[PDB]
Amino acid sequence: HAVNTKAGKQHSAESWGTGRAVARIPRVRGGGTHRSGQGAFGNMCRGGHMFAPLKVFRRWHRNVNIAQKRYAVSSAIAASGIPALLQARGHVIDQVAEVPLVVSDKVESFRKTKEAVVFLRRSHLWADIEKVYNSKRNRAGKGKLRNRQHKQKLGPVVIYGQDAECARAFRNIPGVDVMNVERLNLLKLAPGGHLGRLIIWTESAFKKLDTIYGTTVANSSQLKKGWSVPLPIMANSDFSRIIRSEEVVKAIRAPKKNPVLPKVHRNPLKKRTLLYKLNPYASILRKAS
Amino acid sequence: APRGNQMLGNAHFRKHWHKRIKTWFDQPARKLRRRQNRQAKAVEIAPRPVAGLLRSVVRCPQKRYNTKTRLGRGFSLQELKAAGISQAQARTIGIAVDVRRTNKTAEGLKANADRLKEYKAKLILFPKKASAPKKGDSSAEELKVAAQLRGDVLPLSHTITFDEPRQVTDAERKVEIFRLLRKERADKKYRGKREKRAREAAEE
Amino acid sequence: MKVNPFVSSDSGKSRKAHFNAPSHERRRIMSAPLTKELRTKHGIRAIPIRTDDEVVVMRGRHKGNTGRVLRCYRKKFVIHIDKITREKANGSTVHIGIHPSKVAITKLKLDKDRRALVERKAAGRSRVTGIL
RNA sequence: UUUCUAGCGAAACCACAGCCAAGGGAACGGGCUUGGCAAAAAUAGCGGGGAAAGAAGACCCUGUUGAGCUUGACUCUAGUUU
RNA sequence: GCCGUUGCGACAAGGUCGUAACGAGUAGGAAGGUCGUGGCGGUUGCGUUGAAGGCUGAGCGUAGGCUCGGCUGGAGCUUCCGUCAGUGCAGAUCGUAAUGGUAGUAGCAAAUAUUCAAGUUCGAUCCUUGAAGACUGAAGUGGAGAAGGGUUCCACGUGAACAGUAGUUGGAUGUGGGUCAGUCGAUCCUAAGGUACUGGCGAACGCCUUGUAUCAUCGGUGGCG
RNA sequence: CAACGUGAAUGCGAGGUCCAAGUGGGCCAUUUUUGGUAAGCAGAACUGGCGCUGUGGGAUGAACCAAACGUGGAGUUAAGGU
RNA sequence: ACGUUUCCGACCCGUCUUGAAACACGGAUUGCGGAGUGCUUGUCUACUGCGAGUCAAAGGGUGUUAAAACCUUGCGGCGAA
RNA sequence: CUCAACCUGAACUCAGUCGUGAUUACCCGCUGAACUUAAGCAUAUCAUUUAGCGGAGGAAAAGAAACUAAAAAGGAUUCCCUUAGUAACGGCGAGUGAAACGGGAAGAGCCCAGCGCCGAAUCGAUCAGUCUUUGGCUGCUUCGAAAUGUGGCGUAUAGGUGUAAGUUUCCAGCAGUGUCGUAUGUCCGAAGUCCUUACGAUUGAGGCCAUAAACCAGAGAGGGUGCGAGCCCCGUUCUGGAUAGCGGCACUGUUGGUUCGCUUGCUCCUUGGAGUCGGGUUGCUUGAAAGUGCAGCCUAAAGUGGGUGAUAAACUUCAUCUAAGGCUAAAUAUCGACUCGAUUGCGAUAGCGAACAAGUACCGUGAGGGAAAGUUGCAAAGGACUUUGAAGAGAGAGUUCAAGAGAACGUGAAAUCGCUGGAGUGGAACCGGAGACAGUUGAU
RNA sequence: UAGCUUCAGCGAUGGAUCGGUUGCAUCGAGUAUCGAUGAAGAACGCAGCUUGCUGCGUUACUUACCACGAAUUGCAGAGAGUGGUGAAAUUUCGAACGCAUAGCACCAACUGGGCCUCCAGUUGGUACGUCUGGUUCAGGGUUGUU
């Protein structure tokens, strides 16, 4: 997107200089029309060019490291297998049988949205689609005027291994995406950059997963030359278990409290008990007196 | 006013560069257009290979590249004669002819001769008139297998091979490699001066 | 979702086409649905409304009223129905424009061309319903 | 003419506003300090003050800012002679 | 006593708490901002039983600002997470639009001058009629034209605007009408001069000469027909 | 290599690297001091200030005396005063 | 609390300036608009992936929620003297 | 001196053709600045660029080596990445600045002059036949072009003669048969206006046998309809169907024309562009540096000759092409024109100057300059009628969800201004701190 | 009291803001089509009532043909009217063509004026450069013949 390169610069405008009791901004020339003598060009002027007109050759697209793309896709796939992350992302998986949810290859044979809807409803995934239906709304702002009239929630994504044209059964269901396991899109696996998309795996795709993304052994992937599952920098990722392990407990010292300071300095010169506590001989001296 | 330790500026933007600007927003569109053109050409010239004419094997010119080979413009007349193909026959059969290239070495000639022989072996020739086949013409069950080839015809192989381990020989070990290299350099450098000295001695 | 690359999902383009459509296109735009009985009788779902048809108002402040359509004010995208009128201040009577999409056809004005059109629509409906 | 009346009806200017003495302060205050004082709303004049208004001083200087003109300034050139 | 900064410390926490000292600030540098604005990918919700916008009481926050209440309004708006920016105005003799004091004020004073009765009108210094009194004073405030204007010409209506008062009147405004040529002009001739042809020049659009430069530039009586 | 062991006072944690802003008109005062008849003049030395800074006092004041600043309270004072 | 009345304090903001309340300049009033940006090239710093490697270009293959995503480099850039 | 040729040059309202002038985004040839940077300024830079002139197309231009180079070599042109901010240029200052190799997109080759052979075997008008007639095919038609040479073979890979082997058609139209595309027209399409409720108006809320359920969904894009709609309508999906037309293909038939060739071996013969190249000097230009490209003047060739091999000159090793003649698609550029699809862009002071009777009103003699201006309501239902006034206008009334939506009509801010009530009011007014009053608000 | 200032309420002047949007900006795709057969542009004119805008050209807000199939609409009014578009037509200036450039003049036919040497009307034609051919020519320029 860019503004016209000549926008605001189509006036043969000259400054009046000093001595005319007006600002030295360039002004439209001529007469007989209200435009004559009005400020031109400058960004402060009505009808002038904006400040630093936006250029068409801006840096629109980006180069993204292939290794980092693969890492992100793998991390999204792994996060899709955590029920808590799906709930945090807002998917309704209250009654879902299992996560990851693998389904038989018959789903790839579907041809009718009626079949697809029946399958979803019996699998107890219709709650997500109902939430999508309730979530459809009007987008706020100028986006309405720009072919982005509505905003609605995202539903599950069905991943297939061998397309028997099964996407036709699912296209028309709101919020439901369909993908081929060979070419998995991060934009659909982690919409909005958030982890925990709800995925319906077919048996073929679930089996091909190991072939595509390999394992933790180096160069274990066959369809991605030299790729393998990344290794973690932390083996046990739950912070409380290490802290309360036997070795750590043995090494740790017993907990303490905040050191206690007197805080308030009293006046033993004015009081009796304090002075005697600090110096017991003062009582003897006073007795002698 | 550059300040501190900097690399002196070098940007070439002192011309009215805003008048000459080229963007690449149509790169995927151009990719799709070229794919569509390839598909149209394939339909037009089926079952012939989409790549078109067969190209020759070449050695890259300079010593920085002469250890590699690549595809050439075509086959030399010497190469065609060695392979037993006329220039006209090559033209009608779909073999590129490089009228400018000439062979000065048997190995280079023979590599392309073998390439031509292999292509001729793989070639399938349809009858000029379907009803009446002729000599040299391929057989019917061969024609039934004809399919369009995509990509380069007889693509080259760029795999690198490692020589088999062997034994180190005493003759090899006894050579003075550095002294040999320096001797060759000295001989080339001082050839002319030695010739001048020899001529002067002969005159004396 | 549309798949045709030559069909535009642009709201502005759609609105411009709708509001600058010529008369023959406004004829198609101003279509009305057949009642249930007429739909089972004729085999079609909707037809471009025509003068001298009989309709029943299905929505609005005049819902339930019946009558014959006098005019198809294509310029105003409305139809004037018999007996659906109000009184101006002076006392004169003016028909109230109703959008054909909010009425239902109760009887078709049939002639040679309209019969042919209904036959075409019914045959196409039968074909597609059989395929489905 | 001004003046008063009926009708009609602008503009300049305007940080906020308009009583003084001395003091000190950007060395000449309407504002600050100490004193003199201090009572609505107005009409007609007036030219002391508002360092009054008109104009980013046409004087002087600075700028590695110009332009008209001159020549024994530097570098060129139409033309002309050979 | 409270707020915050700094240092240190406790606690299974991008957090809470404890503790001692500390707290000036132009130019300038950093940090925090559940301060504010507009998009995008997502997420959380509200809405014709009333959104945005607008006016303004009960509160909240050191502040940037925010929440709620009441009234107006009639269709959108919003939480939080990332990320992006045409993201915050008191000034720039800033741009643009509108509005004040001045102020019912300066002023509407050159060209001698108007008065009486009547008419019309809702309404008359100003329109019309009559009577009177003055002026231009024939190198006119008279009667006609050239350039220019273009309907301003004439008739009948006129309510608003305009006629720097007024207006029943008007070069205004609405509706109509109006310019008649053998003899008046143009048309025709050439003047100063312009511009073509050739010719030459010119990278070219095209320029130069109107001249023996260029140049094979024709037309007149008669017979015959 | 063998032995010897912290050798004046007081105070206090120390050292290293990188990136970069603004500034590059200063002015005033005690003392010293050059030009000048002098100057609220021109030019220097040490230190402290104003600039960047409010607060009590000197009626008033950029620099003088006291004293430097989160927001409040009680008590006591500095210079100055009754 | 932008109401009234009392006691104390209280000079008009922005700007250049050693010094502004200045007899220095801009500012009659209000609304809306209004000024460190884009890109190329460096350098440092923070974060992320891999690591003697890393990134891969044009391109090709695929992809119809097809300008995306996914796959793909005897060779090229930087680094390894 | 008569007549007849040729050569040269004319006139024709002679028969039939062709050119002119527009367009600007891209393309080709010329002409050609200064601002600016160098912290001044003249070479330099801006820039071989604004401006000016001419000439085409759907692309243009270029293009089949008088090339790159120095390997074990590549092999027309165009374009991309890289080479590379490198070699190089530069008051060696500011600054400027390529190419080959390498990886790719696309790839297509050819024709003359000359020499030699046939030697007019060639061609235009006109006439007459004939056909599928905005053009073609046949001639004892008649004229003319052409020996100052049209056509055939033939061009550096050469070529030709003879000879031995093998091998031998190709174009254009018409009709049919299918096979496939069409930014080409026209026609055709699944499912609720169901019950209750809300509303001015629903598309808003709830319910519609069933474990899985209102129904359709290969259609839940978009728009319209009284804001909200897959299911009311147009539409959307059917890698949509039917139909008519345009095209491209493949095969059959048929009409016209055309084919003594083509390749490899052997034999003999043969083989090429001049005021051009090159050189001197001058000016411009380039990264091109004792001259990269271009041009003026002088000089002016040769025939294993000529050019080139990036430092000038002789004498030497070679390597590589063949200048001074010509044609040629694709990859590439470009929204100026016509037709389309989109968007992290603007939302009426923004976005094009122009959302609207916008290049309009208006201004200038002229070149030229150039605005402001969006919104009643779902529907005009646009306020009948009564009443005062000459009228504007007002008081009633009516329409409407609503008119305080009443025509300059959605909302309706601030500045500014008028009224009613309260309170203050001695040459400013505002303001911070602290009370009081009036007032506001809370109290299981 | 009035005036002035201020507070609360009400009302003016003004047109900000908010809410979309047949507009604009940018990106991408497909195609190649101006003119003497008169272009681009300009002028004038054309409707029952219609100034402007849009459309059109004397057949003038359009004729014919083909598809669809009942309207247009402000008031009238009477295979409609829309779309496509292959037939017909397409005013005057304008490269602009008879010469000039806001005017006047030549050629041929035909028609009317009674006849026509004179008038009037209609039709067709008369531009520059250039190519091919045709006709009529000029020159001791070269040559042949009497």
Render chain B in DSSP notation, one character per residue. ---SS-PPP-----S-GGGS----TTHHHHHHHHHHHHHHHHHHHTTS-SS-SB--EEE-SSTTTTT-EEE-S-B-HHHHHHHT--HHHHHHHTB-B-TT-----HHHHHHHHHHHHHHHHH-----SBTTB--TTPPPHHHHTT-----SSSS--------PPP-PPPHHHHH--HHHHHHHHHHHHHHHHHHHHHHHHHHH-
Q: How many Å is the maximal CA-CA distance in chain B?
A: 88
CA distance C31 to C16: 19
Supply the DSSP string of C98-131, one letter for each residue: E-GGGEEEEE----HHHHHHHHHHHHHHHHHHHH
Taking contacts as CB-CB distances below 8 angstroms, the residues of chain C near A147 are: 9-11
Taking contacts as CB-CB distances below 8 angstroms, the residues of chain A near B20 are: none
Nearest residue of A to residue C11, measured between CA atoms: A147
* Residue A286 parent element (H or E): helix A281-288
Cα distances from A94 to residues A82, A85, A86, A100, in angstroms, run: 13, 13, 10, 14
| A23 Cβ contacts chain D strand, under 7 Å | no
Q: How many Å is the maximal CA-CA distance in chain A?
A: 116
CA distance A126 to A155: 9
Cα distances from B108 to residues B58, B67, B83, in angstroms, run: 8, 13, 13
* Residue C63 parent element (H or E): none
Q: Which of B49, B103, B104, B52 shows the shortest CA–CA distance to B75? A: B103
Using a 7 Å CB cutoff, list residues 104-123 of A near strand H.
111-114, 117-118, 121-122
Residue with tokens 């038989």: A104
Angle, helix A203-213 to helix A66-79, in steps of 10 degrees: 140
Å separating the CA of residue A109 from the C1' of nucleotide I100: 89
Q: Which nucleotide is at minimal CA–C1' distance from A18?
A: D56
Show which subunits contact C, needing at least 3 CB pairs below 8 angstroms: A
Q: Which of C92, C107, C96, C43 shows the shortest CA–CA distance to C73? A: C96
Q: Which of B136, B112, B132 shows the shortest CA–CA distance to B54? A: B112
Cα distances from A248 to residues A252, A256, B157, C128, in angstroms, run: 6, 17, 60, 75
Q: Where are the beta strands (DSSP E) in A203-269?
A: none
A&C contacts, CB < 8 Å? 5
3-state secondary structure of A23: coil
Residue with tokens 């900097």: B6
3-state secondary structure of A91: coil
**Token digits of residue B118:** 């292999």
**Token digits of residue A88:** 């945090």
3-state secondary structure of C78: strand
Contact present, B and C (at least 3 Cβ pairs less than 8 Å): no
CA distance B45 to B149: 11
Q: Which amino acid, one-letter code, is at A127?
A: A
3-state secondary structure of A285: helix
**Token digits of residue A26:** 């360039």
Residue pair A229/A218 in contact by the 8 Å Cβ criterion? no
Q: Where are the beta strands (DSSP E) in chain A?
A: 14-15, 26-27, 101-103, 137-138, 150-151, 157-160, 177-180, 199-202
Q: In the β-sheet with A199-202, what is the strand arrangement from edge to edge?
A: A101-103, A199-202, A157-160, A177-180
Query: Please, is B25 exposed, middle or buried when counting C-beta atoms within 10 Å of its C-beta (0-12, 13-18, 19+)?
Result: exposed
Residues in chain A whose Cβ is within 8 Å of chain C: 147, 149, 171
Residue pair B69/B59 in contact by the 8 Å Cβ criterion? yes
Cα distances from A38 to residues A11, A33, A42, A216, in angstroms, run: 11, 10, 11, 71
Mutation for testing the A interface, residue in B17, B19, B25, B27 having most A CBs under 10 Å: B25
Q: How many CB atoms lie within 10 A of CB A168?
A: 14
Those residues whose C-beta lies under 8 Å from the C-beta of residue A186, and which sit 6 or more positions away, are A69, A72, A73, A76
**Residue B129 main-chain phi, psi, to 5 deg:** -115, 120
Q: Which of A59, A24, A31, A60 shows the shortest CA–CA distance to A45? A: A24
Q: Tell me which nucleotides of strand F come within 7 A of a protein CB.
A: 19-21
**Cβ of B23 under 8 Å from any chain A Cβ?**
yes
Å separating the CA of residue A106 from the C1' of nucleotide I104: 98
**Cβ of B21 under 8 Å from any chain A Cβ?**
yes
* Residue C73 parent element (H or E): strand C66-73
| A224 Cβ contacts chain G strand, under 7 Å | yes
What resolution does the deposited structure have, in angstroms?
2.6
What's the alpha-carbon Rg for chain B, to the nearest Å? 29
Residue pair B23/A56 in contact by the 8 Å Cβ criterion? yes
Residue pair B78/B103 in contact by the 8 Å Cβ criterion? yes
CA distance B91 to C59: 78
| A17 Cβ contacts chain D strand, under 7 Å | no
Taking contacts as CB-CB distances below 8 angstroms, the residues of chain B near A5 are: 18
Q: How many CB atoms lie within 10 A of CB A191?
A: 16
Residue with tokens 């020899």: B198
Residue with tokens 């006073």: A286
Q: Classify each residue of C28-60 as buried b or exposed e, where b means 16 or more C-beta atoms within 10 Å of its C-beta.
A: eebebbbbeebbeebbbeebbbbeebbbebbee
Q: Which amino acid, one-letter code, is at A276?
A: Y
**Token digits of residue B92:** 């009608």
Distance from CA of B157 to the nearest CA of A (A): 19
Contact present, A and C (at least 3 Cβ pairs less than 8 Å): yes
| A244 Cβ contacts chain D strand, under 7 Å | no
Distance from CA of C127 to the nearest CA of A (A): 19
Supply the DSSP string of A26-77, one letter for each residue: EE---SSSTTTT-B-SSTTSTTSPPSSPPPTTS--S----HHHHHHHHHHHH
Mutation for testing the A interface, residue in B13, B16, B19, B21 having most A CBs under 10 Å: B21
**Token digits of residue A106:** 């018959």
**Cβ of B16 under 8 Å from any chain A Cβ?**
no
Q: How many CB atoms lie within 10 A of CB B127?
A: 13
Cα distances from B185 to residues B176, B182, B189, B195, in angstroms, run: 14, 5, 6, 16
CA distance B76 to B69: 16
Experimental method used, please?
cryo-EM
Q: Cβ contact (<8 Å) for A147 and C11?
A: yes
Q: Which of B109, B138, B108 shows the shortest CA–CA distance to B126? A: B138
CA distance C69 to C98: 10
Using a 7 Å CB cutoff, list residues 61-120 of B near strand H.
61-68, 70-74, 77, 81, 86-89, 91, 96-102, 104-105, 107-108
